[PDB]
């Protein structure tokens, strides 16, 4: 949503 | 016969999903220090949103995330790297 | 640095010696049991409690199992008469 | 006891 993001494995 | 995975989770694993009061979220039972949060979308089909303390599930997808604000819905520290998984019901 | 590893998995039925198991308190039967998806009850032998420091839930390893049958309606396991069940000895898994 | 008894699969 806004307080966290997807990152690269 | 299937057995419950306890770490290094992958899609298709049978997993144990437990309520984590400290983090105000359902998580995958695990022996690793790494957090695997149950995606919000998964709760209704699992009968975990009207709570029930546990349920068996099967991982259907898995996402690597990082907390960018000190206040977040996962109650984890700023910068924490964690996984979010979607799971569906499993039965024998 | 990245590394690969084997991981044991928790058995949930048809338990065998050497299985990794989840040991939980069954309030309905006043006893610790193995977590299972099947109708058969696997009760933790009372001898196994002190070394598990149960003398909520524990990971354990099955060491022995014994098939049993209740011969009285009133028993320590709170199972109906004629119920067939297992007693298991297990040690902790840390 | 005689509360419960050992059983085994028949062979
Ligand atoms: Cl903040
Ligand atoms: Cl950050
Ligand atoms: Cl392990
Ligand atoms: Cl006993």
**Rg calc of chain A:** 7 Å
How far apart are the first and last residues' alpha carbons of chain B, in Å? 9 Å
Rg of chain B over CA atoms, rounded to whole Å, is: 13 Å
Terminal Cα span of chain A: 19 Å
* Number of separate strands of chain B: 5
Q: Globular, elongated, flat, extended or rod-shaped: what is the shape of chain A? A: rod-shaped
Assembly level = heterotetramer
Q: What string, H for helix and E for strand, traces the elements of chain B in order?
A: EEEEE
Largest interface: B-C, 13 and 14 residues
* Domain module count of chain B: 1
- Backbone shape of chain B: globular
PDB class: signaling protein/protein binding
Keywords: Optineurin, signaling protein, SIGNALING PROTEIN-PROTEIN BINDING complex
Assembly: tetrameric
Entry title: Crystal structure of FIP200 Claw/p-OPtineurin LIR complex
Care to describe what's here?
The complex is a heterotetramer, with two copies of chain A and two copies of chain B. Chain A is mainly β and 9 residues long. In chain A, 0% of the residues lie in helices and 33% in strands. Chain A is built from no helices and one strand. Chain A has one strand at residues 4-6. With 92 residues, chain B is mainly beta. Chain B is 0% helix and 40% strand. Chain B has a five-stranded mixed β-sheet, with no helix packed on it. Chain B contains no helices and five strands. Chain B is globular, with a radius of gyration of 13 Å. Chains in contact: A-B, B-C, C-D. Chains B and C meet through loops of B and loops of C. Strand 1 (4-6) of chain A pairs antiparallel with strand 4 of chain B. Bound molecules: chloride ion (4 copies). Chain B: Belongs to the ATG17 family. Chain B: This is RB1-inducible coiled-coil protein 1. Chain B: It is found in: Nucleus; Cytoplasm; Cytoplasm, Cytosol; Preautophagosomal structure.
């Amino acid at each position: 949503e806004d307080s966290f993001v997807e990152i690269r494995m | 016969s299937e057995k419950i995975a306890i770490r290094d989770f992958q899609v298709g694993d049978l997993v144990l999903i437990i309520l984590d009061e400290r983090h105000d979220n359902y998580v995958l039972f695990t022996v690793s220090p790494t957090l695997y949060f149950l995606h919000s979308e998964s709760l209704p089909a699992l009968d975990l949103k009207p709570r029930r303390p546990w349920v068996l599930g099967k991982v259907m997808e898995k996402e690597y995330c990082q907390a960018k604000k000190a206040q977040n819905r996962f109650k984890v520290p700023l910068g924490t790297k964690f996984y979010r998984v979607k799971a569906v019901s499993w039965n024998k």
